Design a protein around this ligand. Structure first.
Ligand SMILES: CCCCCCCCCCCCCCCC(=O)OC[C@H](COP(=O)(O)O)OC(=O)CCCCCCCCCCCCC
Ligand SMILES: CCCCCCCCCCCCCCCC(=O)OC[C@H](COP(=O)(O)O)OC(=O)CCCCCCCCCCCCC
Ligand SMILES: Oc1cc(Cl)cc(Cl)c1O
Ligand SMILES: [Fe+3]
Lengths: 255, 256
């Protein structure tokens, strides 16, 4: 209420000032209004807002230091994921899964460098097909390439899955329309894998990890890229199946 | 890809991002913002919302002051295709026993040089006293009520009749209403206004609004669309034991 008065008026002055400086004409104004009505008539608001701004909303709420870097949450988020204690600890995947086989390896330590046994690491990512879990007419609503993973008591974590590939935001919806058509660019996101991490007495982390030589690194449609988060790739041909091995050392909050 | 859009949008994103940073806009603040947006769309309230907070500004950069009638914001309640009012005393279509004081509006349309523009067509629209515009209220049918078109006579005079508008209040229940009332501790009343559009071959179309002298809300328009050259004196008159309100205004169009 007093906070919204502050921002709202500060916001207002700013847009008005934009209209005045750029002499926004009526047809223009009307084209914006129609456009916004679009975005809402589809369901792309969270899509649209997260794609341009949440990278910034994250660089403020969490912070910007040796905390291992934060990345956008993203509409695709998994709630109530399944616990995993598998043999080499695979993620749930439809049999004879296309895509490169992938192995992630890493840790959960803090400031000091001592493991935080009480951690819970939630992971999710798209198919090689370019479709996420739950929501796509081509996929069941059932937990696939999503899950919750506990670290070892020394800290270390590991899981198997498949190698994600760059997803493009629909070339056809208002957001894509903007990225592709009117702005004349691309709506591709670099191949990434999502991560959340919970604990007792630690601030939660939410982020992504990308890959080296990812074509859309230096042009993420959602601007969620940092340097600290681009992973080194180890190409190993366990023959028939070719493998991709990756490492990461997640550090955390501290309440 | 328009460079207009390219250059503008880019600056726009920089602006908004600096804003987030300058004001330490938090995740739960951001989620509230996003949620409010969604709610605005669902109330189908984007035109009401943008015109309210911004049309004034676009209007002020997109048509001049000078010796022609001042423009003012169109707002979200215009509809094309209102009927030609033809008649012994033209009257806006109205429901039976429509609440409110008979008003009679007189005036004319001329050019910046005094010539009557007999080719003008004047659209007029306003709300009901109950505070509703036809085509934009589930409480009114999608028919032309309090909307119509008037033409000048060979000599330039316009004349129509109608109920008298009264101050309108953007609905407190809706997203916009919440914003203004609850969140900003401000009201959401506009003052009584007649909406006008005049078009005519040869001339630049005029979209303006007319207000009433003494209106409780002149100095407090929620939408901030009032202009003094646009404030009509009202003249109370009795005819056949009838409290008519006279309101007169002389429009001047620009050439082109
Ligand atoms: C052509 C220009 C485009 C204009 C885009 C429209 C911008 C959206 C308008 C945002 C209004 C925010 C609604 C305020 C939320 C609210 O009303 O609930 C109040 C809430 C609960 O209190 P009890 O309190 C809050 O936590 C709200 C804090 C958020 C501050 C809102 C300030 C609006 C500034 C929007 C710019 C942000 C850019 C992402
Ligand atoms: C709370 C966060 C704020 C959310 C605001 C989001 C609104 C962004 C609107 C996106 C612009 C839409 C471009 C549509 C382009 C198009 O449809 O092509 C038509 C025409 C050619 O494009 C035009 O010439 C229209 C020029 C409009 C300039 C777009 C640049 C964005 C301006 C920021 C909006 C602030 C103005 C009220
Ligand atoms: O012409 C109007 C414009 C806006 Cl924004 C709001 C109302 Cl209530 C109007 O009557
Ligand atoms: Fe993703």
């Amino acid at each position: 209420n007093t906070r919204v008065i502050e921002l709202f008026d500060e916001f207002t002055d700013l847009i008005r000032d934009f209209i005045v400086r750029h002499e926004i004409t009526t047809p223009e104004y009307e084209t914006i209004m129609q456009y916004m009505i679009s975005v809402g008539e589809a369901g792309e608001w969270p899509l649209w807002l997260d794609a341009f701004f949440e990278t910034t909303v994250d660089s403020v709420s969490y912070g910007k230091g040796n905390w291992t870097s934060s990345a956008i949450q993203g509409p695709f988020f998994k709630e109530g994921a399944p616990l995993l204690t598998g043999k080499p600890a695979t993620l749930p995947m439809r049999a004879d899964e296309p895509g490169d086989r992938m192995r992630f390896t890493g840790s959960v330590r803090d400031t000091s460098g001592t493991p935080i046994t009480g951690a819970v690491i939630d992971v999710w990512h798209s198919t090689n097909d370019g479709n996420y879990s739950f929501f796509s007419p081509a996929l069941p609503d059932q937990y696939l390439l999503r899950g919750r993973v506990v670290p070892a008591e020394d800290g270390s974590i590991e899981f198997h899955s498949i190698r994600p590939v760059p997803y493009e935001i629909p070339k056809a919806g208002p957001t894509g329309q903007l990225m592709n058509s009117y702005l004349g660019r691309h709506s591709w996101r670099p191949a990434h894998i999502h991560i959340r991490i919970t604990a007792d007495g630690y601030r939660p982390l939410i982020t992504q990890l990308y890959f080296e030589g990812d074509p859309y690194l230096d042009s993420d449609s959602c601007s969620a890229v940092k340097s600290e988060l681009v992973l080194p790739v180890n190409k190993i041909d366990i023959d028939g199946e070719t493998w991709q091995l990756v490492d990461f050392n997640f550090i955390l909050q501290h309440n």
